[PDB]
Amino acid sequence: EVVAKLCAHVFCGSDNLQIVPGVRIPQPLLQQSEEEERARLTAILSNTIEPADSLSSWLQLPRESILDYERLQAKEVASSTEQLLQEMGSGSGSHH
Secondary structure, eight states: OHHHHHHHHHTSOBSBOOSSSSOOOOOOOTTOOHHHHHHHHHHHHHHOOOOTTHHHHTSSSOHHHHHHHHHHHHHHHHHHHHHHHHTTTOOTTTOO
16 A cells, blocks of 8 residues: 555656655656756756655655664664673573
8 A cells, every 4th residue: 555655656647646745856848858858857956955754755754754773773772782791601681
């Protein structure tokens, strides 16, 4: 269903899609020049800049889930460090 919604957003669109909040992709023009349209899309890519919150803004998922995944990665690291510290004498907290 995630793939389905992304296909509903990226493909279905008329004259203005706004894949990301900053960029708008206009549908082909009446001049019907393919070199001109290539240059047009290259320019629409050159003008835009990837925001800092790109993983939460360009991807429709929110920022809370970003913080959660970061927390998860940190928890993995800390747990592995503690388990390594107990297997070779380095943890007074666990000690009894």
